Design a protein around this ligand. Structure first.
Ligand SMILES: O=C1C[C@H](C(=O)N2CCC[C@H](c3ccccc3)C2)c2ccccc21
Ligand SMILES: O=C1C[C@H](C(=O)N2CCC[C@H](c3ccccc3)C2)c2ccccc21
Lengths: 305, 305
């Protein structure tokens, strides 16, 4: 019992983090096999960030301008290339601590653990979601670029995120491990505003099912609704519209609890129209949207890695 | 920028977890050097838990009744002993993955990371606090006994908690690594009720300083107060009383922000008397008490391990 924002154990990723330095700029890299992956803005000065021509800047750089250190031990750089927004540094040694892994591009609403790093070293781990506006609500300071987000299934680390930047509103943007940004952001110090941050409705439902499983049941009501009717309400409160794919994904939680999805939706609707009246759900006074249905079942069934 | 409930990287502790089985009961152990530490209720059947005589039960057990597995590899048990509520199994091999470590007994209000484990394997990591009533508000299922709580400073893992039980109210109780319970709980299936769960006032203040640092400033007011006056208010809202030791510990945050502690206290007081009026602070609609002043500075300054 209990319900916490829980991250994956970070040990498999800790072994992969290194420090990459180019000229006077330092950030974090991810060493997998004989490749180090890092943000291409490793090659810029802070002045360069106003309007960088990365191709032009990279011509001035050789293999020996890229220092890569793993713990206190220096890697030899034998090749470099740019893919989208990331640099791929070929080194002469395979990482012996390399886990089984995959690169995945996640969808908005999906969750992942972040291992925040500075200077190639782990400082902390936390969970977050890809928001519908393709930002994450991270915790990251100067030097945290190259930190990565990941999921773990049994033996296999799926890398989904690499951190690149903070917006002036204090939320975070980054890439997949092929270098392509999530959302419209670019790796330049320019005006970039994030769009509407909608609430991940299927996640909120999953969390209400979690609450029921844990004994918090005060918000169950006598009502049901329809997908069309609930969606009129979600639109008004800036919730993402619920589809039948979502309903399908909630079917295990619905079965475990005996609460039909549409009845849970009617519960949600009343909480939106009426608020929480100063009450809490699973220790929160807000509706939580950063647990996926898979997260809830995993946490409430004790899956290990 | 941003502010998250962040756990320590778990890799140093992942290497220490093992599975301990006695008869048909299985839980988690912590292998450090040539000792495996685990909850003594490893030796009970679920029937035994009603009223166990652990000394009597342990006479029936030899070295070879204790199976210890690390990954898929069996350890040889060469000695056993009971210290308070834990068992110490001497094995013939030192753990090669043993980190620098210490056993510490923490005070109520202090925070730590939990590596939840089942069958000797990591499933997730999260932060929590020792509550003033000596419970923790964990996330733990059957088989999670032996999981441990820890802090990390640079190279050194300080183990503070080992999980033993869930109360009928769904909060958690456990020991230090010498086997002594936090609070009055016993390792028996008996009526055990937790006392008043007070709010950790110095932690809430620290979190308000965190909010200020991150740009959330709406709740700053024009008032100040006195320690005596604030405490009349804390008592009424079931907050722990603030002492001058607390004020001293908040002095770095006070200096960083230029907000005198007593002025921040007056802010707190108004939030207690008036509530949040449907607003949020650092993404919460409640006042958060599970960040210590040290946690806030660590997170807001990028310390690594
Ligand atoms: O979360 C982050 C990452 C960021 C960072 O480490 N930068 C150095 C590397 C180049 C970065 C950059 C990217 C785009 C545009 C202009 C500059 C800034 C930062 C700076 C301050 C606070 C928080 C954070
Ligand atoms: O958090 C926990 C740990 C607990 C556990 O794994 N137990 C097996 C081992 C003996 C335990 C026990 C302790 C005291 C009294 C009676 C029995 C019960 C449990 C059971 C269900 C849900 C959550 C949890």
């Amino acid at each position: 019992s209990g319900f916490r924002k829980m991250a994956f154990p970070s040990g498999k990723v800790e072994g992969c983090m290194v420090q990459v330095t180019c000229g006077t700029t330092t950030l974090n890299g991810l060493w997998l096999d004989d490749v180090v992956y890092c943000p291409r803005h490793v090659i810029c000065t802070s002045e360069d960030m106003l309007n960088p021509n990365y191709e032009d800047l990279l011509i001035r750089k050789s293999n020996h301008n890229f220092l890569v250190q793993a713990g206190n031990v220096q890697l030899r750089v034998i090749g470099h290339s740019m893919q989208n927004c990331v640099l791929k540094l070929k080194v002469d040694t395979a990482n012996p601590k390399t886990p089984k892994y995959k690169f995945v591009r996640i969808q908005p609403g999906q969750t992942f653990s972040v291992l925040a790093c500075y200077n190639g070293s782990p400082s902390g781990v936390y969970q977050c979601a890809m928001r519908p506006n393709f930002t994450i609500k991270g915790s990251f300071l100067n030097g945290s670029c190259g930190s990565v987000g990941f999921n773990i299934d049994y033996d296999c680390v799926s890398f989904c995120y690499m951190h690149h930047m903070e917006l002036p509103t204090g939320v975070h943007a980054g890439t997949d491990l092929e270098g392509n940004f999530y959302g419209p952001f670019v790796d330049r110090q320019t005006a970039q505003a994030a769009g509407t941050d909608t609430t991940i409705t299927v996640n909120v439902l999953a969390w209400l099912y979690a609450a029921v499983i844990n004994g918090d049941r005060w918000f169950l009501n006598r009502f049901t609704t329809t997908l069309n009717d609930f969606n009129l309400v979600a639109m008004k409160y800036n919730y993402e519209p619920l589809t039948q794919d979502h309903v399908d994904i909630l079917g295990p939680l619905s079965a475990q609890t005996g609460i039909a999805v549409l009845d849970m939706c009617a519960s949600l609707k009343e909480l939106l129209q009426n608020g929480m009246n100063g009450r809490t759900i699973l220790g929160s006074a807000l509706l939580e949207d950063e647990f996926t249905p898979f997260d809830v079942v995993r946490q409430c069934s004790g899956v290990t890695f």
